[PDB]
Every structure is written in structure tokens, then in C-alpha cells.
Amino acid sequence: ETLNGGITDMLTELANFEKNVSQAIHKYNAYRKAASVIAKYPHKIKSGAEAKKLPGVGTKIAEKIDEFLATGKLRKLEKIRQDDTSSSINFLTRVSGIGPSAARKFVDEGIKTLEDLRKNEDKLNHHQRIGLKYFGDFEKRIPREEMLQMQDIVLNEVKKVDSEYIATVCGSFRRGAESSGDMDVLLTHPSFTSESQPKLLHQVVEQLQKVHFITDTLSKGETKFMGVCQLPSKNDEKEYPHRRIDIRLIPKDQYYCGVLYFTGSDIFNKNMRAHALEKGFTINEYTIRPLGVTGVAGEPLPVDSEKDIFDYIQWKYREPKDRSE
DNA sequence: CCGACAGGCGCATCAG
DNA sequence: CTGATGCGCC
DNA sequence: GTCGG
Ligand SMILES: Cc1cn([C@H]2C[C@H](O)[C@@H](COP(=O)(O)OP(=O)(O)OP(=O)(O)O)O2)c(=O)[nH]c1=O
Ligand SMILES: [Ca+2]
Ligand SMILES: [Ca+2]
Ligand SMILES: [Ca+2]
Ligand SMILES: [Ca+2]
Ligand SMILES: [Ca+2]
Ligand SMILES: [Ca+2]
Ligand SMILES: [Ca+2]
Predict the structure, then answer these.
(1) Where Na(+) 2 is bound, by residue?
(2) Which end of chain A is more exposed for a tag (fewer CB within 10 A), N or C?
(3) Is A44 a catalytic residue?
């Protein structure tokens, strides 16, 4: 499918090992940055030396590319693939609510399969129970057609609670993707700003629960909701898969920093925020602030557009669709 | 010789 | 109960 | 694991 697919799959596979098994989050980030920059690279890689010229590709990854180009495989990945404890820790992380730490603890106590998870539901917290319950469904992708139906429902139900709410579907959907992993809703309301909860998120969640769109809750606070949703199914047909849904209530005046973050992609955001540091700024979902001599953020800069944030760090403006891999 | 590596919400655990 | 720290996730 | 350096 892809030009350097073998290379990027390998580096992605190695990344997952370092994150899930070794618990080295920055090694995982290094492999991702290496995979990302190679993916965009428009030439077919003929050697490890050619790859090392790209930023984020060093001596060790170059050698691994040489081994991959020569033999068509990696001995390190063979060793990891065949190791049972590694595979079990790597598998359990795919369940929503289980990360590297918990997965390891489960494997130590003889829990290595879905069978073992379902038989030992008592050992799992609420977040994890739901992730286990809809395991197969959360693995599936959401067609854009279904994302449009989900958008129609959420916007209509949000309007019915209050006409001054504005909901925006971000994520890969806003980047014009054919499919998505889940729905990401960015919410605002005039009553909530950075200068001044009133149950603003609750009322929207409650109304979406009331009409049976939202089926479960993984976690829920005043600004951030995290849970499960499902489209209405017709008569005599199989039900739609249960889908992950995130709703985030960001202050109305800080919408553009918010929508920038939640539009993505993830590696794009990491690069932008990393580039902001080198330019002497710091970016979060709320603001863009200048860094002091000791790395202390100053007062928020005036942001009106998404482009404004790009301008401060001398970046050519990329439309949502140009922020993918 | 290290350090930094994006940044923060919700939830959980520990020491006091 | 705080405050510090860590987990899982976005 | 890479860059900074
Ligand atoms: C997971 C993750 C998300 N994000 C941001 C970018 C994402 O667009 C946003 C939440 O979107 P996600 O639903 O996490 O991912 P996505 O929508 O980009 O891709 P998919 O279609 O597979 O769901 O938050 C990060 O900056 N870093 C991360 O590690
Ligand atoms: Ca590509
Ligand atoms: Ca390089
Ligand atoms: Ca998980
Ligand atoms: Ca998404
Ligand atoms: Ca999401
Ligand atoms: Ca049902
Ligand atoms: Ca402007």
C-alpha cells in the first residue's frame, strides 16, 4: 500500500514494544517520529545511510533499516514476536483502560487472554470493564457516512439543550478522512470563558444519554467527557458497533487553540508543539504563550484564527486535510 | 556527563 | 482531608 | 532513540 511501508510498519511495531513492554515513552516517540518522517519522504529508501539524513533518524534506526533492506525482516522483532510474555503485555494494552503498567501486572498474575479478562472481571475497574465489553467494536473503524449521522444527532441534540452551544466534530473527520477511530466533539458556550460549573457539559451529556445516543461513561469531569455512543439501528438489521466518543468543553474565547489540538493528527501536534519550544513558545489546548529565560510561560498571545498560531512559529498554514500522515 | 523529549483532564494511590 | 506522583488517555 | 552539542 505505502512506499516505505515495510520500514514504517517495522518502526511502528518497535515503537509499540517500547511503549507497552519496556515502558520507555520517549523511545516510543523516537520510533514514531522516525516512522512519520519516513512516511512523508517521497523517495524509495535504498539504504540506512539515506534514511539517517532525515531528521529523527539516527545510527541505530539506520542499522535496523539496513538489516530490513538486506534480509526483509528484523531479528529483534522476531524475538519479540515469539516471546509470549511480551505478546500478552502488548495485547492487553489494546483494551481501553489498560496501559503498560496494568497489562504487566495482569500478566504477572497469569492473566494473558480475553478469556482470562472475562473470567476475572472482578479485578478490573469501570473504565476497563467497558473496554473489555466493547473490545471488538472499538477495534473497528467508523465510515464517514456513519460519522455524518453521528454529527447530525449530536448537533441537533445540543441545539435542543441550548441554541448558543456550538459543537464541532474534530479528529480525523475534520481532516476529511474516509474513516475514523472515534468521534471527537469540541464544545463551547458563551457562559464559559477563560475569565468566568454551570453544568454546561453535564446537560449535553444527559440529553445525549436521554435519547440513548450515549450508552456508557468511561470518565466524566466538568470540562472533559469520555465514553461510548451508538447510532440508532433499524428493524431486522444487526446493530451498529458501539463507538468511542470524547466531548471537550473549551472556553469560547480560546476556541482556536482548542480546535487546533483536537483536529490533529497526534504526531502533527507533537511536531508543532516541539517546534513551538524551539521558537520560544509553548502551546496547549487553551493558549500559546512565550517562554521565559527559565522556561516559564508568560501571558497568552492574541489568537483569533488557527493560522495565527502557525504564524507565531513561522509555519506555512496547513489545512486540516494536510495535517495527516 | 546528563537532559529534554507536548501538555493537561480525570481518576487513583500513597504519605501524612 | 491535601499535596505529590503516576496511569491511561486525548 | 535522537538531537543538542
Ligand atoms: C491520541 C493523541 C491525540 N492527540 C490529538 C490529535 C487528535 O486529532 C485528537 C484526538 O483524536 P484521536 O481520536 O485520539 O485520534 P484521531 O482522530 O487523530 O485519529 P483516529 O481517526 O484514529 O481517531 O487529539 C494528540 O495530540 N496526541 C495523542 O497522542
Ligand atoms: Ca503517506
Ligand atoms: Ca538525522
Ligand atoms: Ca489501552
Ligand atoms: Ca478520532
Ligand atoms: Ca478520541
Ligand atoms: Ca443494544
Ligand atoms: Ca489574524
Answers:
(1) 93, 95, 98
(2) N
(3) no
* Four-point Cα dihedral A199, A203, A206, A208, nearest 10: -140
Q: What is the number of other CB atoms lying within 10 angstroms of the CB of residue A70?
A: 10
Virtual torsion, Cα A125, A130, A284, A37, nearest 10 deg: 110
Looking at residue A55, the DSSP 8-state letter turns out to be T
Nearby residues of A285 by Cβ (< 8 Å), 6 or more positions away: A248, A250, A254, A257, A258, A261, A262
Query: Are residues A107 and A90 in contact, defined by beta-carbon separation less than 8 angstroms?
Result: no
Angstrom distance (rounded) from CA A42 to CA A51:
12
Mutation choice for ligand 1 from A28, A140, A142, A266, CB with most ligand atoms inside 8 A: A266
Specify the resolution in Å. Answer: 2.6
Domains of chain A: 1-83 (1.10.150.110), 84-140 (1.10.150.20), 141-261 (3.30.460.10), 262-324 (no CATH)
Cell of A174: 475534520
Within 10 Å of residue A212's Cβ, how many Cβ atoms? 10
**At A138, which helix (H) or strand (E)?**
helix A135-139
User: Rounded to an integer, what distance in angstroms lies between the CA atom of residue A56 and that of residue A20?
Assistant: 21
Tell me the technique behind this structure: X-ray
Chain centroid to CA A192: 25
Is-cis flag, bond preceding A265, omega within 30?
yes
Phi-psi map region of A131: left, alpha, beta (phi>0 left; psi -120 to 50 alpha): alpha
Calculate the angstrom distance between C1' of B2 and CA of A270. 24
CB contact at 8 A, A268 and A253:
no
**φ and ψ at residue A49, rounded to 5 degrees:** -65, -40
Distance from CA(A166) to C1'(B10), angstroms, rounded:
23
Q: Is A172 annotated as a binding residue?
A: yes
